[PDB]
């Protein structure tokens, strides 16, 4: 679920404030996305966007108002490492991993202040 | 989700082992149920059974393999009191409460060893 993602990032990047940091960054971190990611962190976001698009195509998973962000799963955060509970159902397991993958992704990528609030109508 | 229910009970009745305790008790604690509950604890179970039946009728909620036991929600257990996370979606919120209600229910009801493994084909 969205509230769990922010907390997974905080989990992964202790020194961060996701809302502020990754929202409206590059071409993909933020609602929608278009064009080609402007950097590596942005590509992390694009890849997550795509994860959620796949999720949506699981004929067996039918998310509330078709929004995967609405699905709550079970994960643990212990000293920088994220684990998705193995008891999550197949749909939850799937969203869990998209989130987990994005967080690690964000962790290892270089952040560019320049790319925050970009003029997407022009560079994406 | 089922694994969260057992742990909610343990939460509510520290001195217990749910699996053993409440599984195959009376007419309703256990898969199915028929007849009239044999006591108060059994009625707790019947009421939960009914909760899950209602759940199933939410045109907006479409559980994996139609089994509400498969839905994982977010709750907290702090010193005997159970809280369902307010950020659970409407479907999860619903299953959360059925579970929460059953647990309190089990807590305040008298347990009868007699009623464990009953001859349901005869008394239910
Ligand atoms: Ca996006
Ligand atoms: Ca039952
Ligand atoms: Ca869920």
From Swiss-Prot, chains A, B:
A molecular function (GO) held by this record is: signaling receptor binding
Q: Where is the lipid attached (N6-palmitoyl lysine)?
A: 56
Cite the binding residues for Ca(2+): 28, 30, 32, 49
Q: What does the miscellaneous comment read? A: Loss of activity upon alkylation of His-48 with p-bromo phenacyl bromide; Ca(2+) and Ba(2+) protect against inactivation.
Indicate yes or no for the key word Disulfide bond: yes
Q: Which residues form the active site?
A: 48, 99
What protein name is recorded for this chain?
Phospholipase A2, major isoenzyme
Per the annotation, which location comes first and is thus the protein's main one? secreted
The UniProt catalytic activity note for this protein reads: a 1,2-diacyl-sn-glycero-3-phosphocholine + H2O = a 1-acyl-sn-glycero-3-phosphocholine + a fatty acid + H(+); 1,2-ditetradecanoyl-sn-glycero-3-phosphocholine + H2O = 2-tetradecanoyl-sn-glycero-3-phosphocholine + tetradecanoate + H(+); 1,2-dihexadecanoyl-sn-glycero-3-phosphocholine + H2O = 1-hexadecanoyl-sn-glycero-3-phosphocholine + hexadecanoate + H(+); 1-hexadecanoyl-2-(9Z-octadecenoyl)-sn-glycero-3-phosphocholine + H2O = 1-hexadecanoyl-sn-glycero-3-phosphocholine + (9Z)-octadecenoate + H(+)
* Gene it is expressed from: PLA2G1B
Q: Please give a single GO biological process term from the UniProt record.
A: neutrophil mediated immunity
Alphabetically ordered keywords of this record: Autocatalytic cleavage, Calcium, Disulfide bond, Hydrolase, Lipid metabolism, Lipoprotein, Metal-binding, Palmitate, Phospholipid metabolism, Pyrrolidone carboxylic acid, Secreted, Signal, Zymogen
Function noted in UniProt: Secretory calcium-dependent phospholipase A2 that primarily targets dietary phospholipids in the intestinal tract. Hydrolyzes the ester bond of the fatty acyl group attached at sn-2 position of phospholipids (phospholipase A2 activity) with preference for phosphatidylethanolamines and phosphatidylglycerols over phosphatidylcholines. May play a role in the biosynthesis of N-acyl ethanolamines that regulate energy metabolism and inflammation in the intestinal tract.
Activation/inhibition comment: Regulated by bile acid salts. Up-regulated by cholate and down-regulated by taurochenodeoxycholate.
- Quote the EC number: 3.1.1.4
Instruction: Indicate the transmembrane segments per the record.
Output: none
How and how many cofactors are bound, per the record note?
A: Binds 1 Ca(2+) ion per subunit.
Q: Which residues of the full protein are shown?
A: 23 to 146 of 146
Localisation = Secreted
Subunit description: Monomer or homodimer.
Q: Which cofactor does it need?
A: Ca(2+)
In which domain of life is the source organism classified? Eukaryota
Instruction: Family membership, please give it.
Output: Belongs to the phospholipase A2 family.
The entry's cellular-component GO terms read: cell surface; extracellular region
User: Which cysteines form disulfides?
Assistant: 11-77, 27-124, 29-45, 44-105, 51-98, 61-91, 84-96
Post-translational modification summary for this protein: Acylation causes dimerization.
